[PDB]
Structure formats: structure tokens, C-alpha cells
Ligand binder design. Sequence first.
Ligand SMILES: *[C@@]1(O)O[C@H](CO)[C@@H](O)[C@H](O)[C@H]1NC(C)=O
Ligand SMILES: CC(=O)N[C@@H]1[C@@H](O)[C@H](O)[C@@H](CO)O[C@H]1O
Ligand SMILES: CC(=O)N[C@@H]1[C@@H](O)[C@H](O)[C@@H](CO)O[C@H]1O
Ligand SMILES: CC(=O)N[C@@H]1[C@@H](O)[C@H](O)[C@@H](CO)O[C@H]1O
Ligand SMILES: [Ca+2]
Ligand SMILES: [Ca+2]
Ligand SMILES: [Ca+2]
Ligand SMILES: [Ca+2]
Ligand SMILES: [Ca+2]
Ligand SMILES: [Ca+2]
Ligand SMILES: [Ca+2]
Ligand SMILES: [Ca+2]
Lengths: 275, 276, 260, 277, 132, 132
Amino acid sequence: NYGINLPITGSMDTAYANSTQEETFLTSTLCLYYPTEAATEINDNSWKDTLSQLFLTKGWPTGSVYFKEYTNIASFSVDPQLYCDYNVVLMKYDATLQLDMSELADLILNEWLCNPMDITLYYYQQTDEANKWISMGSSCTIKVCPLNTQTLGIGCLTTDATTFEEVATAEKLVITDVVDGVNHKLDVTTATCTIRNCKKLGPRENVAVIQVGGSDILDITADPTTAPQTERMMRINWKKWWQVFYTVVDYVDQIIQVMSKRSRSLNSAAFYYRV
Amino acid sequence: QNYGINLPITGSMDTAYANSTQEETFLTSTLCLYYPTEAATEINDNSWKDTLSQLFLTKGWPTGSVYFKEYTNIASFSVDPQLYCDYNVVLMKYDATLQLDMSELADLILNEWLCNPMDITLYYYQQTDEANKWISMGSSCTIKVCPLNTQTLGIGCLTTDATTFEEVATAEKLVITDVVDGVNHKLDVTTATCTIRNCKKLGPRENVAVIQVGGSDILDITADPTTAPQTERMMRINWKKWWQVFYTVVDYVDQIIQVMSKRSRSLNSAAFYYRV
Amino acid sequence: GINLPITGSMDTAYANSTQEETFLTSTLCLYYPTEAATEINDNSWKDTLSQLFLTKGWPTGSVYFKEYTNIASFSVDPQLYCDYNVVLMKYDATLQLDMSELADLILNEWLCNPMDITLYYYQQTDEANKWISMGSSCTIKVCPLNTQTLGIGCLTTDATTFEEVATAEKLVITDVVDGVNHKLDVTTATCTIRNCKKLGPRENVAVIQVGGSDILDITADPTTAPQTERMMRINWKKWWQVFYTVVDYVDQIIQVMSKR
Amino acid sequence: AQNYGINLPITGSMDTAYANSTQEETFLTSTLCLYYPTEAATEINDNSWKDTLSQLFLTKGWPTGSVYFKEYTNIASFSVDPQLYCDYNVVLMKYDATLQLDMSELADLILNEWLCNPMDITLYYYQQTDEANKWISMGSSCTIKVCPLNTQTLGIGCLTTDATTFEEVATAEKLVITDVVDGVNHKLDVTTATCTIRNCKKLGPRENVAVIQVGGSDILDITADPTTAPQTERMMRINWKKWWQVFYTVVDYVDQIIQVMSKRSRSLNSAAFYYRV
Amino acid sequence: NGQIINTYQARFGTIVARNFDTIRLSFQLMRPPNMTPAVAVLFPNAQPFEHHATVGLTLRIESAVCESVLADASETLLANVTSVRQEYAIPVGPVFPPGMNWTDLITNYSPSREDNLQRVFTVASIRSMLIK
Amino acid sequence: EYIENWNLQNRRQRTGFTFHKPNIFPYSASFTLNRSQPAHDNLMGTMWLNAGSEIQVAGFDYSCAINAPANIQQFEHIVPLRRVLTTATITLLPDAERFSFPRVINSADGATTWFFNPVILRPNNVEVEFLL
Ligand SMILES: *[C@@]1(O)O[C@H](CO)[C@@H](O)[C@H](O)[C@H]1NC(C)=O
Ligand SMILES: CC(=O)N[C@@H]1[C@@H](O)[C@H](O)[C@@H](CO)O[C@H]1O
Ligand SMILES: CC(=O)N[C@@H]1[C@@H](O)[C@H](O)[C@@H](CO)O[C@H]1O
Ligand SMILES: CC(=O)N[C@@H]1[C@@H](O)[C@H](O)[C@@H](CO)O[C@H]1O
Ligand SMILES: [Ca+2]
Ligand SMILES: [Ca+2]
Ligand SMILES: [Ca+2]
Ligand SMILES: [Ca+2]
Ligand SMILES: [Ca+2]
Ligand SMILES: [Ca+2]
Ligand SMILES: [Ca+2]
Ligand SMILES: [Ca+2]
């Protein structure tokens, strides 16, 4: 495949294909993430059986639709894994974790190229808008001290650690954006947190986001200027979860249609270590 | 540019060969050696990483590029071997008892597996063809496998009783279960300490070499009996002191990296097939 | 083995896959050690395996299982008479010559002749001429002979001075020097030993070795240790997976065998 | 009968008739030596098994005095100074399972031509030029400790004055073939009282000797290189129950064992001034 | 024949090309370095591009002198040839495309097809002199 | 013959030069990888030698169509000519001899080399078409 450089021509007068959507159903898998509050309100032992029997009539085979359960958006943010061919996430909204859904969908909806960071030795910087520092763990307290040309902290002291400028405080997953082109010093608690210098590639398109409730409050881009609403940012107003699950299983043919299984990554992870 | 679709690639058979660029391969990439945790007991040093990195400096690698990692044994390295750097090479002891488990770890390490999840309670399971396996990793995997006929009745087993199932794995860190293709099976995976996974090999993994240290030369990395290909990347060395093994690796860095390619899935050009 | 030329021609059409018709009209036979069925400890495991063979195109009445106790007890008289025979041989590190000479008896085809040791003296004429002994205890003492019928390093009357090549072994394949006659002291109370000659190898039976690294030097010379297409060997922890691997890959195992 | 050190290009036709059999004259002219461990002559139970074998070699074609028998106690004591004498050599060695580098280093000496220079450890720091340079030490008890220097004669992980800070690549071994990294000057701590170490260069294979591994699996790694484990024509292995089968097999197949070896390329008159011995 | 006969660098309107058999258009898209706020919202640095940059050219040969016969918007000779071949229900022969497809005739414009086309166009010009 | 064809083409009539093994093909020794990767251990595509009057083509698959549909891999090789040949006697043999022994070959960009160890099957379903 490695000769990507040769262009493909094609023609504007050739015939359309014969609707390769039913053959997409047979040779694919589908994992829909649901919070544990769903499985509390569901009140069934064999509701995966009921739903999978309903997925059978949509064109899927039996052994294709799996479900995976997470506790909340904070615990899913620790190490989110995308296991199968088409992933959709069902996330319940509240106004508190307003940023913890924006940065979670920032991690989930894009392909990230992450590299490790040894903050105890080296001084790191960000090259352009594309990279961020994405840090995950059970508790991340990130304190960033900016330096100058002479390796001296501006408005701070390099030696003392209490004069630092904290960016995050006791957070499961953080996406820090700092000033590009300035060497910085870190106080990430490495016992419970790993921070990674990580560039943003193109978006991952096997996973869609279903904000169950609330308002249209989500962004990918960390600039204030652009707050894009992509084709797989979608939202549902809820009263019971059964309307939500029946809504998902009814409109499978529309939800896959805004996704692409070509963006499978061979690993369930989300960060592409050591390129 | 132009990812996705496959293109035919033509080229003249009288094009001039390029330069050596083994220099640039060493000066660009990384390297990761994997030794068992008892090796540093024989080594008797706390500053032999500092020593050996200066030894790797001679053959073109810079200081902070060759990386050293540990593992306790071949069983607990098989719990989750996560290899990612540009060139991985693993040094494993030859245990005459742990013959299959070394072959299992070699089958995991030397091939690339597309991997789908599994739900033991919910569905009934079958394998499509010869490249389809059930890879289960964890603290203790005990797998019992119950075949079913065309009407989902138990063949030699009873789907109610988990005792009458047919036991294929018992308290093993890493299992690659191969059953007959085309028969629906029911499972008894203890999912509290284990995780089974429907995987499918796309091809070999090329950024890892296996150096087994001692013993006789074979790791059966294929399922079938009728072949067991000794590939170019598995290899064997003899030992009395570990220092001779480490010095032999540091000497023949050039040949060991020569027999290992750049892992096609890393490359930009193979982006939207299976890894960017 | 024909010797009248079959001409044939190139550029003629490849026939269709007769592998299915091979499956419908043959008999496949496993040979397992007793310790396998000891760990298996099922009373109807032949049923579940035979139905798994029925999945892969073999009919119902076409797969047979026959035990053997160990490699020593299989080598006293192995009967291989199905259309496709495979054996499952445990690897013992101590029983290393015995696996080699067993697979020599099993994989190759031998034309044998009797051997009355009291009445005659016996030389090996060919390279391919060997002496094959079966029974319960084969104490084989062989002394060479000059041209003038005198013992070389033994007394040709006294049996203590002889030179033994086998001490109470079930199967022994004895190779002595060619062109020299020999006086023999086999124990014919238990052991029957014959003058055999190697024909072309038996393409009926395959050997799945089950255990350690390869040892099989089935050729009598030190020069060649050829690993043929049927010296297969899987590694193992559980016996159930050993049978599931055979049932899955019947196409690639029948593919490297032929009928008799 | 001349031009001994020039390496002239020959020119041979591809229509030359094949010569005669030459095997009978090779059997009448040259000599054969058979090296066996002393456990063989223990299990053989004879004083005159040498004459019994020699008359069987007479049947095979060799004369009476052309087949010489020497022995050794174990692989470790044969490996103290292997000096292999006559025109065709073949050695029988039993696979001890616990020693695997010993047999591979033994066949690394025996199946290769080694051009070796002396060493003085007290004076010089020694680097290896390329891959065929090895450091071969032999004696009663060798214990080699290597100290890698930098480009300033300062040890890397080793103090140049202390010998306990040194690291050992072998201890208490009869023969050691040491391979270290090429281009780095090294300090040594060989016990020079009971061990002599020498600066060796592998010119090529030795053409007159085969090694028959009596029992035990394929283990032989000649080339101290992890990627290649070559299986040449003269690394034969057989399985044993009694030794008499081994001796009758090596006597029956003389015409194959002598065939897979040749005359030694150095020992000819034609290789006069290219390292003749 | 691979040689640059005429070249024109950033000149529009009517141009002239004296002798050619290949036309090479080399235009480039440059991102505008100064953009008003109505333009800067169109082209973000991130991935979702709802407005795609597009740069075009148009090249229309008004009149040309060709040594071989062709068809154009002035003559009606190809129309006369196709009218005669379609009026009398003529089978497809060895040279001309089925139905006198001019796209398939100028796609593979062989010299034998060139000779046939010139002969039949000359006879069509003769008949167009007599028959209106 | 040459002055006859000179005088016939001076009046624009049909000519023919009769050639024994004409040098109609330019020297083009190259290949094409329909399936390739940087490991170069599972390749698929054609190789060819166009020289003088001789085309030697060989399509290779490393998998021997073990995952192709119906265990059949289709190859194709299209050679355009520069001038139209007429009444050609052509020796068509199978089993191209030059691409039947092991060789190492530089890649398309000339960076690395890849190994080619062929075993030869006979060509199934040969279709040779002569397009005008
Ligand atoms: C096979 O191609 O040819 C056979 C005759 O040689 C015929 O009997 C058989 O039906 C054919 N099968 C197929 C699949 O075409
Ligand atoms: C007119 C007709 O029958 N059309 C079908 C079309 O619906 C289908 O997409 C295709 C399948 O490949 O086959 C065509 O023949
Ligand atoms: C034209 C060409 O190939 N140039 C390279 C050159 O870039 C490289 O440094 C050199 C090493 O000596 O090898 C040459 O082949
Ligand atoms: C003396 C000699 O070596 N030459 C003989 C030759 O005379 C004889 O015709 C041939 C028969 O095969 O055998 C060769 O060895
Ligand atoms: Ca501050
Ligand atoms: Ca930034
Ligand atoms: Ca059972
Ligand atoms: Ca299978
Ligand atoms: Ca005696
Ligand atoms: Ca014999
Ligand atoms: Ca040290
Ligand atoms: Ca060296």
C-alpha cells in the first residue's frame, strides 16, 4: 500500500454501486458504551439478550453487537478503550462535568499521536496548535511553571514547588494547552498520573458520541474561535433509558452512515505510542 | 496523501540503488531490549544501563535511544506484553518444561492480531478459518469449551452443566485457543481473572525479534502440525554468563536490526487500513 | 511403483478438487497414548471427536481410534492398515533412539526375509539392508567374520565373548558393516528378528510428535537427518487441544499423505 | 610446481571429461583418526576392539595402519588443547544436556581455521578489529574479566585499577571463545598462570574433520552471531543405545563421512605460502 | 514534441498558440495571508472544512488550422455523413465507430480512420454543394 | 522495396515494409506490484521485458491465491504499439524463461531490494487479444 503518492483518477460518469450497507452489517461489530446508571434503571438480567434480538432484525448477525459498561464519564476517562468496529458512546449530561465531556470527546473522537514525558529531567514545550499534553490516571494535579530564555521562571520560582501555577487539580483525564514555544516545568504527580506530549492527527471515525440529555455543549477544538458540531456529535433528550436504547437500535442505519469502520486502529487504545 | 484505496506500484528494474542509510536508521529510530528480572542479579551492577548505552554509542545509536526493560518470567511477561518502540528484541530463557508457553508468547509477539471482544454469557461462538484464534490473557485463565451441533444441542457436553464441558486451559497466563472451524461453541472462561478475545492474524509483526537463550531451536508459532516455520526473526544463542549474551547483542546490533523491518503499521502510508 | 512410462502432456486442464471424494471413500485413524485418554477421562469422547470429524467432510463410519500403551508397547507389533494413519507420539528425552527407530519402522516400507540364526551366517548386502527385531526382550549379540570363517574379536563357539548391540529392548533396528558375515546370538524365546530391506517410504502414515525438539534420524547414515513432510510435531499443555488441532487441520494433514 | 603466492586465475573448460573414482586411492593413501570418549571404551568391554574395528576398516578399504584411535576423558578435557593430527578426522561426542556452550565452542575451534596472534594483558588494551576476531583462551582454569574503556582510556562501568569492579564473561572454563563489541579498547583479567588467551581470526572452515553428536538434539551454533545458526555438512548427529551401534554405523558409513569432508586446504603443497600448517 | 513553443505567465483574455499538440496548464492555490473576519471563519486550522478552496481555469479554442480533418461548430459535414449512415440503416463496418460516435472516433484517431474520414468528408462537401 | 514505398507514399497510397523480427518494442524492463508492503514478503503483480520483438511477461503471487476468490488470481499486461503492424506471425509460448529463476530486485523508489524465488505454474486461461 506504501506507494500512497500515485493519484487515483476515477471518472464523473461511472455507475453507482449496489448499496453495500447490508454487507457492512454482516462483517462488522458494534459496541455501544452505556453508563452504570442505565443498567441500574434498566432492571433486567437478560436485557442484552432482548436488545441483541432487536439488533438481529436490523440486519446484524447474532455475534456482532457487544455492550461494554463504564461507571461514569470520569472513570471512563481514565483509560478509554474502543474495542470493536463501530463504537458509539452514551454519555449522560450534567452541568458540573461540562469540560470533562468536551475533553473526553476530544480524546475519543480524534486520532492522537502521543509520546512519553519524563518531567523530572527535561523541560518540555509545545510546538504548534496541534499538540496538547494529555494526562491520565487516578489523580492528576498538574502545575505548570513557564520559563524564559535564561531558564528562569516568570512570576514564579523554579526551586520552590508551592509557587507553581496549577492547571488541573485531582482530575482523572486532563488535556492541557499551554503557550506554544515556551519551555515549561512540571509538577505532575507521577505516582497516580502519566502526562504525554501528544499531537492531534485527523479524527477517529469509528466512534460516535450520543449526549443523552442536557444541551448542545461540546467542542473538539481548544481555541475559542471554532466550536464545531460534527456529524457524529448527536444528542437525545431522555426520560427513561428504554426510549434511548430503542432509539439507538431503530436508527442503526443512520448512525453507521455517519461513521466509518476504515478507521480501525488494531489496538483498543487511543494514543499511538512511539509512533 | 491518497490514503485508503490501494494503488498498483510500478518501477524500473534498472533504477540505481540508494545509499546505505543504516546510519540514518540508527540515528532516527529507537531500540528496546527485554531481559528476565534475574539477569541483573547475575550482572551484579546498578550502573550497567549507563555502561551498555555507552557500548551502544559505538554502533551509531545515541544515548537516550536504546532502552532497557525487565520482566519477571516468561509467564508474567505473557500477561500483557505491550511492545511499541521502533525495534524490540526479547531475550527469553529456554525452560524445557515451559515449551508451549514460550511458543504461545512467540505466537503473540511475532504476529499482528486484529482483535474483537467476546461475551461468554450472551452468544455462541465459532471460528471462521485457520487465521482465527481465541487469545485469552490475565492472571488465571481456565477455559472449557463445549461444542454444539446444527441445532445447538451439546456434542459431548451439556449447556446447563459447566462441569461436563471440555477443558482446554487450566490456570494459564496466556492461551491461544484453537478449536475446529465452523462449529458453534459455548465457553466457560473465568472472566474475573481472565479476558478472552476473538483475534485474527493479518500478518507477522516485524518490529520484534526473539532471542531464546539456550536449549534447542524451535518455537511453533503456527497452529497446524504440518508446518513450523523458523522465520528470520526468531533465533537462538547459548549462555554461560549473561555478559557474553549482552556483548553479542551489542556487537551484532547491525545484523539484528537488519533482519527486522520498520513495522508497516507504524508508517504514515498504511494509515487508514489498520494503524496510523 | 510402476516402470512402464505414463506419457501425459502439459497444458491440459487441472482436474477438480478430489479431496472431498477422498474424504467420502477413506478411513482416517488416530493413534493416541493411554495417558491421553487418562487425562481426557470421558466415556464418550470418541463420539464428540467423530462428530467434529463429520463436520469436516468425513462420513460417519470412517474415523477409528486405536490406543497404544507407550512407544515400547506400540513397537512390539504396530498394525497400520487404515487408508490414512496418523500417530501421536509423546516425547521422552530418555526414549530417544526408540522414537527414531519406531518412526523408521512406521514411516518407511520394508521388504523382510526370515533369519534362522542357528543354521546360517548373515551378511548385510545393501546399505538399505538392516535387521529388525520385535518381541518382548531382544538380547542381540553380533560377532563379525573373516573370509576363512574365523571370529574377528570373539570366539565363534563361546557366546560370552560376543559383541552385543541390544539389551532387552522391544524393537531394535540393527545396522552392522556391509560385506562381512556375522554370527548371531539373538534370544528367539521372545524376540523374532528379520533380514529387511528398505523400499520406498510408506506414504500412508504420518507422525505427529507431541513434545520436545526433533530427534528423528530415521536414515541409518550420520550424514542425512531429513525432516520429511510427515515428521510433524506440536507443542502442548493439555491433551484436548492436541486432538482439536488435528480435527481442525485434517486438510493440511491428509494433504501431505497418500493412499496405499 | 611453482608460483606459490600469486593467486592466478585458472581457466577450465566445461567440456572436460569427468575423472575416475579416486576414492580407492584416497583410501590407500591417506590416514584416518577417530576420537572417542573414555565412557565408550568403558562400555565396550574389550582390549582388542581396536583390531576388530581395524579389520572392519580393512573391509571398507583402509589399510591396517591407516586408522588411528585416540581417546579423551570428557568434552572439557578434550577442549584443553585439541590438536587434531592426521589427514581425516571425525570426533564422537556425547550430548551432556547441562553443557551446551562447551560443545558449540569446541566445534567452533575444530570446524574452523583459526589464525591466532599472542597477547600480553599487563601491557596492552585490546580491541577487536571485526567479527572474525575472537579471543580464544585455553588452559586448566580460565577466568576472563573484561573492562570496556572509552576513547580516553577510562573504563566504562569498570575502574582500570580495581579488578573486582571488572565483569566476567567466563569463570573456571577450559576453553573460552570471547566475543565483545568491535572498536572498543578493553582491559583483561585472565588468570595467566593456568590459562593462555590468544587473538584469533577465523580464516574459514577446517576441511578435514567432522563432528558426530552421539545423542541429543541439534544445538550447534558455530558462528558467534545470533541471526545465523548454520548447519553445515559435517555436524552429523546420531542416537545411541549401545556404543557398538555407533561404531558399526561410523564403520559402515566411512564412504559418506569421508565424502562430506575433504583434504585440509592448508595442508596441501599448493597452499604453500598462505598459512600452511 | 515536448518542446515549449508558446508560454503565457498570468495573462488572460485572448492568447495565441502557433504550433502545438499538448496543452499544459500550471496554476496554483495560495492561501490569502490577510483575511477579513468574514473570510477567516471559512478556513479553520482544524479538520471540519465546510467551505473548500477551489481554483479554476477555462481554455476555449475559438479557431484553429489543422492539417487533418475534424469536426467543428461551423461546417455540417459530419452531420451529413451521420444522416446518410443513419437514414439507410447501415451496418457497422471495420473502421468507423458504431453509430459514428465522434468521441470514440477522436479518442482513437488512427491514420486509416483519418484517411476514411477525409475521403467521406470530401464527398460530403461535394454533395453539400449540390444537395442543400 | 524502399524506393517503391518512397514512390507510393509520394502519391499517398498504401505501403508495406516486410520486417523479420522488427524492433517495434522499446527496451522496457520493469515490474508492477498490485499487492505490496515494506516487508516485501507477500507480493503480487506482474513483471515484464519488452525488447526488440519479444515480450516476456510473468505475473507472480506469493500466496499462490490462497485467499483469492475461487483460488484464481487474474493478471493482465497491455502493450501499446507505436505503429500499426499488419499480418504478423507471432510465436506465443508459455513459461517466460527470464523471470523463472531467483533474483533480488530494487524497489520502485530504488530504496531497498526484495527477493524473488519463483516456482512455475502453467498459465491457466491465456487470452491474447490484438486490439486496433
Ligand atoms: C469440474 O470443473 O470439472 C469436472 C469434469 O472434469 C466436472 O465433473 C465438475 O462438475 C467440475 N466442477 C466445477 C466446479 O466446475
Ligand atoms: C435490475 C436488477 O436486477 N438490478 C440488480 C441490482 O438491484 C443489484 O444491486 C445488483 C447486485 O449486484 O444486481 C443487479 O442486477
Ligand atoms: C547518488 C547517491 O546514491 N548518493 C549517495 C550519497 O547520498 C551517500 O552519502 C553515499 C555514501 O557514500 O552513497 C551514495 O549512493
Ligand atoms: C584408468 C582410468 O582411470 N580410466 C578408466 C577407463 O579406462 C575406463 O574405460 C573407465 C570405465 O568406466 O573407468 C576409468 O576409471
Ligand atoms: Ca506563580
Ligand atoms: Ca498550545
Ligand atoms: Ca465431555
Ligand atoms: Ca480453527
Ligand atoms: Ca568380543
Ligand atoms: Ca549395513
Ligand atoms: Ca562493573
Ligand atoms: Ca566483535
